[PDB]
């Protein structure tokens, strides 16, 4: 059971983090929401930024001392061809993607972590679960997904290596590659866009389910882009 | 899942056994399927055509639609490409690979055949079909040609299953599992698996309607 | 010296082809000289791998390219997919490849080494299906997804005797319409003599081993 | 043949980018050598600046006329515990690791391409080959890996879709993925040794030849996995 666990949801105020942090909230757990803007604590906070991620952090032992849980999900899907009628992909563009994507989950894995490490153990050894958001385009990048695909890529990618440091102190890290998500009639089965319920209910699952570590869950009814 | 008729393969030890006992603590029906006793059990050669058959007969008189699958039948043996003794014997690769791959499919093909004649429940399903790789068809050490290639036929059997089957609205999924307790050096949990944690990923598939056409690996992370 | 699986065509043949201009000796499988022999028979591949070594006194190379790439549904209009078609196929792409495999790396096993310390590189062909089965390949992307499979384990155990292990996962091949127009680059079939490039390519370069690669032009299913 | 064509190589001074330099200059083939430091042309460039990347184009499309090869091999490969000692990794760090190893190549790319693009065709329809180094840690990432793994998983997983949107062009981008090699053991199955870096080049050099190989990223490896 999650009741009385805290945890962390980044893209909170809205689609996989709104329905995750709701999630939570049902099964009687403890949420830090964090988001850029406004829609269970919620906080504003730039997950690229060092000093907002710190201060979430600050926040979360002060307001409740613990933290066992991580769920990133904050996320750009933007897209842009390498090749414009304009010109080249705007390089800025690129490097927005990967901030948010890769480099903010990662800083909010590292600070995160700092934290669950301390925190009492359960019958299994299990101290903490990180889950993260992918994308199929990490594996099925389609035309314009270049920036998406390579940022999501580097998620699926970190997995395993954070699963391997972090299985010390007993925390998981796993990560779901989703497929087309209703958020903010090509899908095998079932022919319709996931609900974000859905991706919630499988993050949960991940909670619940001590051998599931290290691994990229794809969740897109066997759509390939 | 209560009321609903699952078959399940390998039913009387390990991975089966937690996966029926799963099911029928969640009021489901079983159909539970072995070569040998350990809900009702019966024998059955999965590999066989006409016992197949006469087992998918039993459960339609018996029980009548289906809507469960899982493949739980498999053995796991050891041996050299190249022993003391010489190479590998053939028959054994054969059997390993009829046991796991061909076993596999014939109760694919026959289980989908009857949830395609049942009617779909709220989102449009007409059965899951749930398989059992091993995560030795992505990291096969020495020793395990027979049983990866065999776990690995059963992997890249998922996809092109799910893709067809999604006409009738039947998911097919597959678990990658890690070392299990059935009948160290794992990242975490350094621990060997209960077949319980396996027969929860099952009825979390069973769930969810998302999950489809994919192998999940089911390991504490361990790269063999 | 190499042994060729499938050789009287397509992959085979172009393979065959391929060794034969670069001055190997090629012993041709199928049903440079060539035997009639089943890829799935513990005799045939026995006398086969026997004919070789009295014949030749070596082996140094393997490539198998027997293959079966049959289309049939799981639930078809008549009923459900036959389980001998299926066995059949599992029964040519994988046991067929498999023994072959034993066989040769029995004999390479008992060759001199190069400089490089190799006894041995043995090719197999998986197949592009092994990773996106299309509907109707379910025979097809089993078998050669257990090639696939079969190929990191293989070439863990292999490492002993110096014997390397590769399998070539092709797309689309001119062997024996716009399903050409669809593999984005480039937009064609592809030739058998390219896919034998690459076995040539593999042959090469030693830190080549327990991979499987797609040669699909960035084809996917 | 590789002989006239004109190729872009990154990290050109050391390692894998001077193999691979080498091999092209053996084969006929004019060269522009990137890299921060030097030791065919050398030019001195930061391959994360967009200045000194249009400056390295501009410069080869004057001096050379065409541009049919990007091949890159700047990379960094710290490691650093998520959790360490001191503290948690460094941001600046993990940033500075996917700004070199992943914003670098596709920077190189997008600019490269642009070029090859306004090129004509070759007999097989081909404007350009784009070769990208990753490596085995984006797929077998180890302890203390994470920025150097999820980097050249962010390298891997950009190949698909640039091979996909640049196909129109007829440029085919391919991504391997090295094991351990020796640039600046009894664990590798076999070869039980380093890689030289001439067998890096090697592959890249079946890359250009090969037509058919295309969206896809090869372990060169020896089998090991990490």
Known sequence: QLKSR???????????????????????????????????????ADVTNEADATAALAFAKQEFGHVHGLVNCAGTAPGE????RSGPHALDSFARTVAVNLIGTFNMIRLAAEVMSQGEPDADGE????????????????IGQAAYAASKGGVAALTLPAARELARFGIRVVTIAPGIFDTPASVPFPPRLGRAEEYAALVKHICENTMLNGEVIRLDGALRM
């Open 81 to 84: 061809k390498i090749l414009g």
């Open 6 to 44: 805290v945890f962390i949801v980044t893209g909170a105020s809205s689609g996989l983090g709104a329905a995750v942090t709701r999630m939570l909230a049902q099964e009687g757990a403890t949420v830090l929401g964090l988001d850029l803007k406004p829609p269970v604590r919620f906080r504003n």
């Open 127 to 142: 101290r903490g679960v990180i889950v993260n958001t992918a994308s199929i385009a990490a594996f099925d990048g389609q």
